[PDB]
Amino acid sequence: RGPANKVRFVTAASLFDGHDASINIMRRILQSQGCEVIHLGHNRSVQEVVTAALQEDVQGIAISSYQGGHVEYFKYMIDLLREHGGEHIQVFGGGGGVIVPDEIRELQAYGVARIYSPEDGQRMGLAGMITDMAQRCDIDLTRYAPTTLDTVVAGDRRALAQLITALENGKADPELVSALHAQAKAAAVPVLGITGTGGAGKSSLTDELIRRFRLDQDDALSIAVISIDPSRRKSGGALLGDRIRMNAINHPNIFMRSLATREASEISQALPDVIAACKAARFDLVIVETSGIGQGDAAIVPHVDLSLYVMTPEFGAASQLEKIDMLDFADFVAINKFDRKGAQDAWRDVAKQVQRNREQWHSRAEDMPVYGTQASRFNDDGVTMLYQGLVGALGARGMSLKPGTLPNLEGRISTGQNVIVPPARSRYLAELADTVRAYHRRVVAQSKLARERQQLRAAHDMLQGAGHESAALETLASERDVSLGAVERKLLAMWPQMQQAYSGDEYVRTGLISTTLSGTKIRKVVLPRFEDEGEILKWLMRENVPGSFPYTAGVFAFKREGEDPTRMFAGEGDAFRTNRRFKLVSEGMEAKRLSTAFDSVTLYGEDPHERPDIYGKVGNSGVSIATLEDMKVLYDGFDLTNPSTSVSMTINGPAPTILAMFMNTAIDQQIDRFRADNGRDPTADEEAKIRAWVLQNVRGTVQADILKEDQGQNTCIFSTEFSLKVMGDIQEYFVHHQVRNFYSVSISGYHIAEAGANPISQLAFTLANGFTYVEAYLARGMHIDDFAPNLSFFFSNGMDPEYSVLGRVARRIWAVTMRDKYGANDRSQKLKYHIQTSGRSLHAQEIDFNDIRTTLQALIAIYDNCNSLHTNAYDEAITTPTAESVRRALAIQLIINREWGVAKCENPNQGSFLIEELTDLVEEAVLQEFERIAERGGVLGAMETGYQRGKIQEESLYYEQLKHDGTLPIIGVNTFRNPNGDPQTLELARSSEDEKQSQLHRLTEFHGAHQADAEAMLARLRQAVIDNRNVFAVLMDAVRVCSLGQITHALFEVGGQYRRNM
Amino acid sequence: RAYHRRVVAQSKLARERQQLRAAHDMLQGAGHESAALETLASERDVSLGAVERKLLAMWPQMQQAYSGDEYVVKIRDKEIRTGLISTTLSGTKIRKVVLPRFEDEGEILKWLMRENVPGSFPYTAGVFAFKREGDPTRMFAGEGDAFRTNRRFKLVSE
Amino acid sequence: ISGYHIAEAGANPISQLAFTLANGFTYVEAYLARGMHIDDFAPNLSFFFSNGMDPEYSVLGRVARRIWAVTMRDKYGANDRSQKLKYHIQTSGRSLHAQEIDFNDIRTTLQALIAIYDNCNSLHTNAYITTPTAESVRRALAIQLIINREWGVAKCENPNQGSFLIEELTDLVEEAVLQEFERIAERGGVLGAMETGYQRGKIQEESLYYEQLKHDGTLPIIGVNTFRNPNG
Ligand code: B12
Ligand SMILES: CC(C)C(=O)SCCNC(=O)CCNC(=O)[C@H](O)C(C)(C)COP(=O)(O)OP(=O)(O)OC[C@H]1O[C@@H](n2cnc3c(N)ncnc32)[C@H](O)[C@@H]1OP(=O)(O)O
Ligand SMILES: Nc1nc2c(ncn2[C@@H]2O[C@H](COP(=O)(O)OP(=O)(O)O)[C@@H](O)[C@H]2O)c(=O)[nH]1
Ligand SMILES: C[C@H]1O[C@@H](n2cnc3c(N)ncnc32)[C@H](O)[C@@H]1O
Ligand SMILES: [Mg+2]
Ligand SMILES: [Mg+2]
C-alpha cells in the first residue's frame, strides 16, 4: 500500500538551473512510492512553481537548487505561497553541498519543511528521504474544498483548484455536484477534446494552439486545460507529464490541472465532474487532453463538444485507418510531426479515409478537416491553419471572439521544408560503425599477409644458408607483395626509417630525450621492438606514433614546448572580479589560456534584475556578463589576437549572442591598439583591414553544443531546431571570414557524464552528436574540410577504467571515419578535445580526499595526450574554487607535468596490454551504441523519444543506488567515515552585494546609452529570422546597442522557447 | 647479462622455427611438398632449450587459464578457485591479469622469459599470482616506557 | 635490507636500488661463507625501497624482482621461495616540503600509485612538519584506500606490463644497476667500497647535485622554487 491519501507533488529545478539529475531521481522514487508527480522540469521561476502547485492543489513541492541564490529563492516561494492560499503546502529542497548547514537551518526556520544535505542522503538513504517527504505530505486536502459554488463561479481559481480535488476524490456533496452540473449546462461553454496515439504531440500541439488563441485574441480568452496521463496501478501514483510541455499557459487567464487516469481507461473516472467545474467557473473554453489511446479507443467523444484526433505519419499500412474508431468521430484530425518521412502520403490516406467515413463523395478530399501540423516548429503555418479551422467551428458553436490578428491563411498542410538531417542519411551512425569495423577487418587481413610474406622470405634465406634453394617459396612471397595494399606496403617500408628518427637525441629540430637525475634517457616517444612485421603493421595501423594516422596516441607529433594544456575554468562576481581571477590563474605563464564560467542568469540569456528570483543568482556560479561593455572589461589586459592567448567560453543557449560580444571585444581591442600606436582613428579602409584580420587570427573556443543541451546540460533557451539553425549560421560566418583559429562548437559529453552517464554512454553520445553536426553541415552544403577542423570536443574523466582510454578511442573513431567515410583531409581527421576532471566524483564529506581523486583523473588525461585539461578544486561539492582552492587544483597539473617522472614520456599508455585491450573494448562498445541510436532514427530521432535522457537518468539512478548502498565503495562517503563527523567553516565564493548593484547600474547605463538604436536593432534581428537570413551576422552588430536579455527576448518572439523533454 | 643473451638467442630460434613450419604449411597448401624446410625446423627443436620449449608449449594452455571468469588450480587434494573478472558500472570485464596477443612465438618466448605473468619466473610483474583481498595495515606504537607502549598496542589491536 | 635511508639521504633511484641489492647480496655471500645453505636464509630476506617522483621509480620494484630471481636461480641455485623478492615501498619523504603542505598529498598519491601498479608487497603513505596528527594520518591512509577501492585502472593487477615505456625503462634501470655492481666490485665489494666511503661519497655527491638544481631553478618544485605562495 502507498500513502493514505491521494498525495500529489510538484517537482522542478530552480530558476536558471539546469541541474535535473538530482530532482529526476527523486520524482522516480516519489512515483514508485505511490505519488502523483507533476514534473515541471528544469529552469522554473518561483512564480511558475507556485502557480502550478496552486492549480494542481498539491500537498508538497520539491525543488532542486544547485546554482545558489537558494536562500532568496525559497524565501520568495514560502512568501508567495502564504500570500496566495498555499500555506499548508509543504516545500522540500536540496542542492547537495551548495546549501550549507547554516542556510538549511535558516530556510527551515523560515518555513521550508526540509532541505536535504548529502549527509542526510547518506544517513536516510535515497528511499528514506522520499519516505520522510511523502509521509509529511500524507494529508487530506478535501477539507480546504469549498462547500458552495459562490467562490468558484465568482472567478476564484484557487477555490476551483480545490473543488476539483474534492470532486476527483468523490468527497464532494451530492447536492453540490448536481448543482454544479445544473449551472454547467446553463454555462454553455465549448469543450474541446484532444486525443490521439501516445507521444504523437497532443500536449505540444495543445500548447501551440493556446499560444495561437492568445496572439489572436490579445489574451482576452479564459482557457481551462485538463490534461490526462496514464497511471501505473502497480505503484499507485503516476507521472503526469503534460504540463512540462506547456509554455504558453503562464498567464492569469489560463488554468491547467493534471489528472491521472487512476484506471490502468483513457479518461479520469471523474472527468465529467471536473469539466463541469470549469464550465461553471466561467471559462471561455475548456480543453481536454487524454492519454495514449489505442486504435479502437474513443472515450473522449461523449464528454466534449469538439474532438481532435492527433496522429503521426507513421501508422503502418493505409488499411489501418479503417480500424481507427476515432477517425469516425473526430471533428478535426491533425497529422502532427509532419517533418517525418511520408507525411504527405499519410495525409492523403487520412484525408480519403475521413471522406469515406463521412460519405462526402461530393466534396474534395483536400477539403476535409484533416490538417498537417508541426507543433515542434515555431509559428508553424500548419498549426495556424488548424487553429483557423477550430476557430470557425468554435465560433458557430457559440463562442464570441474578435476578428483575429493572425494570418488567416488557406490550406490544410504545413509548408515547413526545413531539414537538419535528410531521411536518406538517416542511418548515418550505422554506416560509421560499419566503416570502423571494416577498417579493423583490413588490419587483420593485411597483417596476416605481411606476416606470411616475412615468414616465407625468412624461410627462403634460411634454405639458401643451408644449400637447398627453393624458388617455390619466393613465388608465394611475391604473390603477397601484390596482396598487400599500396598504403600498407609503404608503412612497413618506412618502419626502419621511422625507428632511426625516434632513436637519436633530436628529431630533424625537436629534442627527443629528457635525462633524469639518475642519468637515464627518457624518450618522448617510445617505439615498439617487434620483430614480426605482422605486429609492426598491426600496430602502425591501429595505433601509430603521435602525429600519424589514425592519431590514436595524439594528433600532434610532440606536446607543445611552452603552452601546457592547462586551462582553468573560472568565473565569479562581476567582470571586474573575474578579470582578476584570470590574471591569478594565468600568472607566471607565457601562454594565457582562459576558461570562462558564466552565472546562471547569463547562461539563460537574461539580464540581471531586481526580482529575488533572478537577483540572488546574479554573479553567483559564474561571471555576470550582460553587455558588450562587461565582456570588454572581462578580458581587459588580455590580447585576444595574440597567438599565445586563447579564451574558452562555456555558454550554450545564448552562445551566438555571447560569441558576438567576444568577437566585437577582440576587434575593438585592435582598434584601440591602432589608435594608440598611431594617435588617430583608423580610416574606413584601415579599420576594415584590422577588423577582418582579427576574425582570422582570434584564438579560442565557444561551447554552444545544443544537441547536448537537450540530452545533458539543459541550457537550451530557444527551440532546439532554431538553436541548430543559428549554430550553422555561425559556422557559415566563420567560413566566409576565414575564422580558422576559433572553434565554433565544443562538442561535449562531460555534461552528459555528470548527469550520470557512464564513460561508454558519454563517449558514444558525444561522438554521435559530433557526427550529427557533420551530417547536418554536409546536407547544408559545406565541404567536409571546411568545418571539420573547427570542431572541438569536451570530455569528462572519472574513476571508471574506461576513462583511461576514452581520449584515444575518440581519436581513432574520428580519424578512421573522417578518412574512409567522409574522405576528409588530415586536419579534419585530427580530433582535438578538452578533458575536465569529474566533478560528481568529488564529495562534500572529507573534502581533502578530492585532491587525491582529481590527481588520478588528471594523470590519465595527460597520459592519454589530451589537448586541454581542467582540474577541479577540493571544495568542489561546496563552492566555486577559492583563491587557495584553485591553487591546489592548478598544482596538480604543475606537479604531474614538471615533477612526475613517467610523464616525461609522451606515450606511456602505448604498448600496455590493458590499454590496448580496453581501447578495443570501449571502441566496439561505442560502435554498438551508434547502432542503437541509428535504429531509433539517428541522434535527432532518439532525442524525439528521449532515448538519451532516459538512458542517462537510468545510469544515474543505477550509480546512485549503489553509492548509498555500499556496493560501490566511495572513501569517506559510504565507507571509512570520520569518527568525528566533520564534513568546520569553509570559505565560500558568493557575489558581493555591491557587485550586484554594480551590474544593475551598468546595465541601466548601457541601456540609456543606446536607447535610440535599441528598438530598431532588435527589429532588424527578428526580420533576420523571418526573412531567414544569417542570424549571427546581425548579432555582430546587435551586441553593440543591445543587452543580452534584450536580444534573447527579441529572439523569443521569433525563434520560440525550448520545450522541455523530461 | 648472460640470462638476457639467452633470451635473445632462444627467441631467434623460436621465431625461425615458427617461420619455417609456417612456410611449410603454406607450401603444402599450394601443392609443393618440400621437406627441406622441415629438416631446418626439426634442427631448431633441439637448438631450443628444454625449459624454453616447455614455455611455448604451455602458452596456449596458459591463455585458456586467464581467459575465463575463474582460475582453477588444484593444490593438495582440494582446489583453489580465484576470480579473474571485475565488472565496471558500464558492464566492462576488467581482467585481473591481461595476457599479450602476440602471434610471433619469438615475442611470446621473449615476453615469457623477460616478464612472465605475476607469480611466474622471473616474477617481474610480481612474486604472487594474484593480489591478496582485504586490514594489512600494521599497528605501529612506541613511546614512553614499556607500559605505555603496551597499552597502545593492546588498545589499537582491540 | 633497507634502502629508504640511502635514497632519503640523496641517492637517485639507480644508486638506491643498486646499493640495496648489493647490500642484500652481501648478506647472502656472508651467510654462505658460514657454510650455510641458500634455501635456509633467502626466504627470510625482506626488502625496503623508496618511491619518489623520478621516472625510474615506476619500474624500481620489477627490476629488483628480476635481478634477484635470475641470480638466485642461475648463480646461487636456490629454490622458488628464494627467487621471490618481497619488498616494502614507502613514499619519498624528501619529496614532500614545508611550503604549501597541501601539495604533498598530490605527490604522495602519484608515488603510491606506481607502487601499487608495480605490485608491491607493502606500502606506507606519507602525511601532508608537525606531529603525526590523527587527521593527517587519515589523509595518508585514504590515498591507499581510494586507489585500491575506487581507482579503475587498479582493478587490473598488471597494468604496467606491455607498456613500451615500462619495458624500456625496466631494461635501462636494470643494466644501470648491473654497471653499478661492477663499480662496487672493482672497489673490493660492498665492504671494500665502504672502507673507502664510496657509497657515502656517492650519496653525498647526488644529494648535493639535487639540492643544487633545486636552488638553481633547474629542477622545478611546485610551491618551492616555482608557483610560490603569493601571500606566504
Ligand atoms: C552534475 C553537475 C552538473 C551537471 C548537471 C547535469 C544535470 N543534468 O543535472 C553539469 C555538468 C551540466 C553541470 C553544469 C553546471 N554547474 Co554543476 N555540478 C554538478 C555536480 C558535480 C553534482 C551535482 C549533482 O547532480 N549531484 C548528484 C546529486 C544526486 O547528489 P547530491 O548533490 O550530493 O545530493 C544529495 C542530497 O543533497 C539530496 N538532495 C539534493 N537535491 C535534492 C532534491 C530533493 C527534492 C530531495 C528530496 C533531495 C535532494 O539527494 C542527494 C542524496 O545523496 C556539482 C558539484 C558536487 N559534486 O556537488 C556541480 C555544481 C553544483 N555545479 C555548479 C555550477 C556553477 C554549474 C554551472 C552553472 C557552471 C557554469 N558556470 O557554466 C553549469 C551550468 C548548469 C546549468 N545548465 O544551469 C557549482 C555550483 C556553485 C554554487 N552554486 O555556488 C557546483 C557546486 C560545482 C562547483 N564546485 O563549482 N553541473
Ligand atoms: C559548465 C561546465 C560543465 C563546462 O562545460 S566547463 C567547459 C570547459 N571547456 C573548455 O575549457 C574547452 C577548451 N577547449 C579548447 O579550447 C579547444 O577544444 C582546444 C582544441 C583544446 C584548444 O586548444 P589549443 O591550446 O588552442 O590548441 P590548438 O588550437 O589545437 O593549436 C593552434 C595551432 O597551434 C599548433 N599546435 C598546437 N599544439 C601543437 C602541438 N602539440 N604540436 C604542433 N603544433 C601544435 C597548430 O598549428 C594548431 O593549429 P592547426 O594548424 O590547425 O593544427
Ligand atoms: N519531429 C517532431 N516532433 C514533435 C513534433 N511535435 C511534438 N514533437 C515531439 O514529440 C514528443 C512528445 O510530445 P508530446 O506533446 O508530449 O506528445 P503527447 O505525449 O502525446 O502529448 C516531444 O519530444 C515533442 O518535442 C513535431 O511536429 N515533429
Ligand atoms: C560543472 C563543473 O564545472 C566546474 N565549475 C563550475 N563552476 C565553476 C567556476 N565558477 N569556477 C571553476 N570551475 C567551475 C566544476 O568542476 C563543476 O563540477
Ligand atoms: Mg502529453
Ligand atoms: Mg497526455
Burial class of residue A987 in the structure, from the number of CB atoms within 10 Å of its CB (0-12 exposed, 13-18 middle, 19+ buried): exposed
The Cα A234–Cα A264 span in angstroms is 9
Residue that the C-alpha cell 603525526 belongs to: C132
Centroid of ligand 6 to alpha carbon of A267 (angstroms): 10
What crossing angle do the helices spanning A101-110 and A70-83 adopt, rounded to 10°? Answer: 10
CB pairs under 8 A between B and C: 76
Query: Would the annotation count C81 as a binding residue?
Result: yes
Which of C103, C113, C162 lies closest to A895 in CB terms?
A: C103
The Cα A592–Cα B67 span in angstroms is 49
Map A596-664 to HEC letters.
EEECHHHHCCCCCCCCHHHHCCCCCCCECCCCHHHHHHHCCCCCCCCCCEEEEEECCCCHHHHHHHHHH
Q: Helix, strand, or coil here: A537?
A: helix
Secondary structure element (H or E) that encloses residue C113, with its range: helix C104-117
Read off the C-alpha cell for A452.
Answer: 606470411
**CA C176, C153, A435 angle in degrees (round to 5)?**
105
Our answer on whether the CB atom of A96 is closer than 6 Å to any ligand 4 atom is: no
Which DSSP state fits A758? Answer: -
Whether residues C161 and B98 touch (CB distance < 8 A) is answered with: yes
Work out the number of other CB atoms within 10 angstroms of the CB of residue A138.
15
What crossing angle do the helices spanning A759-778 and A428-464 adopt, rounded to 10°? Answer: 110
Distance of CA A892 to the CA centre of its chain: 30
Smallest CA separation from ligand 2 atom 36, residue: A560
A55, A255 contact by CB (below 8 A): yes
The Cα A479–Cα A485 span in angstroms is 12
The Cα B16–Cα B104 span in angstroms is 10
B86 DSSP β-pair partners:
B94
Read off the C-alpha cell for A232.
Answer: 501505473
Distance of CA A1036 to the CA centre of its chain: 25
What backbone torsions phi and psi does residue C75 show, to the nearest 5 degrees? Answer: -75, -55
The CATH number of residue A172's host domain is 3.40.50.300
**What does each C-alpha distance from C41 to A264, A847, B127, C27, C191 come to in angstroms?**
78, 47, 18, 10, 20
Work out the number of other CB atoms within 10 angstroms of the CB of residue A796.
27
Residue that the C-alpha cell 566533478 belongs to: A839
Q: Which of A152, A182, A187 is nearest to A166 (CA)?
A: A152
Residue to mutate among C88, C117, C119, with most B CBs inside 10 A, is C119
**What does each C-alpha distance from A103 to A49, A73, A113, A610, C127 come to in angstroms?**
21, 12, 13, 22, 34
Query: Would the annotation count B130 as a binding residue?
Result: yes
Amino acid at A564: D
**Which residues of chain A have a CB within 8 Å of the CB of B26?**
452, 455-456, 476
Resolution in A: 3.4
Secondary structure element (H or E) that encloses residue A335, with its range: strand A332-335
Whether residues A891 and C223 touch (CB distance < 8 A) is answered with: yes
Q: Helix, strand, or coil here: A974?
A: coil
Pocket perturbation via mutation, ligand 2, pick of A746, A837, A866 by most ligand atoms within 8 A of CB: A746
Query: Would the annotation count A339 as a binding residue?
Result: yes
Q: Is the dihedral of CA A943, A289, A1051, A72 positive or negative?
A: negative
Q: Which of C119, C146, A966 is nearest to B132 (CA)?
A: C119
**Which residues of chain B have a CB within 8 Å of the CB of C159?**
98
Whether residues B19 and A458 touch (CB distance < 8 A) is answered with: yes
Q: Which string of b and e fits A652-674 if b means at least 16 CB within 10 Å?
A: bbbbbbbbbbbbbbbbbbbbeeb
The Cα A638–Cα A582 span in angstroms is 9
What backbone torsions phi and psi does residue A688 show, to the nearest 5 degrees? Answer: -60, -35
Residue that the C-alpha cell 591481461 belongs to: B98
CA dihedral A41, A43, A46, A50 (to 10 degrees): -20
What backbone torsions phi and psi does residue C206 show, to the nearest 5 degrees? Answer: -75, -30
Contacts of B114 (CB under 8 A, 6+ apart): B4, B7, B122, B124, C66, C167
Our answer on whether the CB atom of A597 is closer than 6 Å to any ligand 4 atom is: yes
A598 DSSP β-pair partners:
A623
Our answer on whether the CB atom of A839 is closer than 6 Å to any ligand 4 atom is: yes
A238, A231 contact by CB (below 8 A): yes
A623 DSSP β-pair partners:
A598
Our answer on whether the CB atom of A652 is closer than 6 Å to any ligand 1 atom is: no
The string of DSSP codes covering A27-82 is: HHHHHHTT-EEEEEES---HHHHHHHHHHHT-SEEEEE--SS-HHHHHHHHHHHHH
Residue that the C-alpha cell 601484390 belongs to: A482
To the nearest whole Å, the CA of A969 is away from the closest chain C CA by: 6
The Cα A957–Cα A937 span in angstroms is 26
A527, A502 contact by CB (below 8 A): yes
Residue A308 exposure: Cα atoms within 13 Å on the Cβ side: 29
CA dihedral A93, A94, A95, A97 (to 10 degrees): 130
Read off the C-alpha cell for C108.
Answer: 604522495
Work out the number of other CB atoms within 10 angstroms of the CB of residue A303.
17
A134, A3 contact by CB (below 8 A): yes
Centroid of ligand 2 to alpha carbon of A830 (angstroms): 11
Pocket perturbation via mutation, ligand 1, pick of A38, A598, A621, A991 by most ligand atoms within 8 A of CB: A621
Whether residues A802 and B106 touch (CB distance < 8 A) is answered with: no
Q: Which of A212, A421, A574 is nearest to A939 (CA)?
A: A421
Q: Which of A398, A351, A228 is nearest to A299 (CA)?
A: A228
Q: Helix, strand, or coil here: A748?
A: strand
Q: In A, what residues contact B, Cβ < 8 A? A: 451-452, 454-456, 458-460, 462-463, 466, 468, 470, 472-473, 476, 530-532, 534-535, 758-761, 800-802, 913-914, 916-918, 921-922, 925, 955, 958-959, 962, 968
Residue to mutate among A460, A462, A924, A967, with most B CBs inside 10 A, is A462
To the nearest whole Å, the CA of C180 is away from the closest chain A CA by: 12
The Cα C2–Cα C89 span in angstroms is 10
**What does each C-alpha distance from B114 to A733, B122, B131 come to in angstroms?**
59, 7, 21
The string of DSSP codes covering A99-131 is: S-HHHHHHHHHHT-SEEE-HHHHHHH-HHHHHH
The Cα A168–Cα C169 span in angstroms is 76
Read off the C-alpha cell for B136.
Answer: 594489512
Our answer on whether the CB atom of A95 is closer than 6 Å to any ligand 4 atom is: no
Our answer on whether the CB atom of A842 is closer than 6 Å to any ligand 1 atom is: yes
- Domain extent for A224: 143-397
Which of B1, B88, B118 lies closest to C119 in CB terms?
A: B118
**Which residues of chain A have a CB within 8 Å of the CB of B19?**
454-455, 458-459, 462
Query: Would the annotation count C46 as a binding residue?
Result: yes
Amino acid at A840: R
Query: Would the annotation count C86 as a binding residue?
Result: yes
- In this structure, chain A runs to a length of 1062
A337, A313 contact by CB (below 8 A): yes
User: Is the bond preceding residue A118 a cis peptide, omega within 30 degrees?
Assistant: no
Q: Which of A16, A13, A14, A21 is nearest to A751 (CA)?
A: A21
Name all chains with 3 or more CB-CB pairs below 8 Å to chain B. Answer: A, C
To the nearest whole Å, the CA of B76 is away from the closest chain A CA by: 33
C210, A517 contact by CB (below 8 A): yes
Contacts of A402 (CB under 8 A, 6+ apart): A217, A218, A220
Q: In C, what residues contact B, Cβ < 8 A? A: 62, 65-66, 69-70, 73-74, 80, 83-86, 119, 121-122, 141, 152, 155-162, 167, 170, 175, 178
The Cα A546–Cα A343 span in angstroms is 49
Strand order across the beta sheet in which A832-837 lies: A745-748, A791-797, A832-837, A868-870
| Ligand with smallest separation from the Cα of A258 | 6
Our answer on whether the CB atom of A572 is closer than 6 Å to any ligand 4 atom is: yes
User: Is the bond preceding residue B122 a cis peptide, omega within 30 degrees?
Assistant: yes
A37, A31 contact by CB (below 8 A): yes
The Cα A347–Cα A341 span in angstroms is 12
Map A417-446 to HEC letters.
CCCCCCHHHCCHHHHHHHHHHHHHHHHHHH
Our answer on whether the CB atom of A605 is closer than 6 Å to any ligand 3 atom is: no
Which DSSP state fits A391? Answer: H
Whether residues C170 and B95 touch (CB distance < 8 A) is answered with: no
Q: Which of A1000, A1001, A1002, A1039 is nearest to A666 (CA)?
A: A1039
The string of DSSP codes covering C26-84 is: HHHHHHHTTT--HHHHGGG-EEEEEE-SSGGGGGHHHHHHHHHHHHHHHTS---HHHH-
A570, A582 contact by CB (below 8 A): yes
Chain breaks in chain C (C to N over 2.5 A) after: 128
A179, A273 contact by CB (below 8 A): no
What backbone torsions phi and psi does residue A792 show, to the nearest 5 degrees? Answer: -110, 155
CB pairs under 8 A between A and B: 102
In chain B, whose CA is at the least distance from the CA of C120? B126
Q: For chain B, what percentages of helix, strand and coil (3-state, to nearest 5) are there?
A: 50, 10, 45
Distance of CA B102 to the CA centre of its chain: 13
In chain C, whose CA is at the least distance from the CA of A529? C164
A349, A364 contact by CB (below 8 A): no
What crossing angle do the helices spanning C60-74 and C164-185 adopt, rounded to 10°? Answer: 60
To the nearest whole Å, the CA of A214 is away from the closest chain C CA by: 56
What crossing angle do the helices spanning A381-396 and A202-217 adopt, rounded to 10°? Answer: 70
The Cα A474–Cα A483 span in angstroms is 14
Centroid of ligand 2 to alpha carbon of A701 (angstroms): 8
Burial class of residue A754 in the structure, from the number of CB atoms within 10 Å of its CB (0-12 exposed, 13-18 middle, 19+ buried): buried
Ligand 1, atom nearest to A571 Cα: 71
Strand bridging mode A332-335 / A306-311: parallel
The Cα A634–Cα A662 span in angstroms is 10
Amino acid at A589: M
Name all residues whose Cβ lies below 6 A of ligand 2: A 556, 559-560, 563, 567, 569, 595, 646, 648, 650, 699, 701, 703, 743, 746, 750-751, 789, 792, 794, 827, 832, 834, 836, 867-868, 870
Work out the number of other CB atoms within 10 angstroms of the CB of residue A369.
19
A300, A330 contact by CB (below 8 A): no
Burial class of residue A105 in the structure, from the number of CB atoms within 10 Å of its CB (0-12 exposed, 13-18 middle, 19+ buried): exposed
Whether residues C13 and A800 touch (CB distance < 8 A) is answered with: no
**What does each C-alpha distance from A785 to A830, A889, B33 come to in angstroms?**
12, 37, 54
The Cα A507–Cα A512 span in angstroms is 7
A604, A587 contact by CB (below 8 A): no
Q: Is the dihedral of CA A617, A621, A625, A630 positive or negative?
A: positive
Name all chains with 3 or more CB-CB pairs below 8 Å to chain C. Answer: A, B
Ligand 4, atom nearest to A873 Cα: 16
**What does each C-alpha distance from A868 to A75, A650, A899 come to in angstroms?**
41, 14, 19
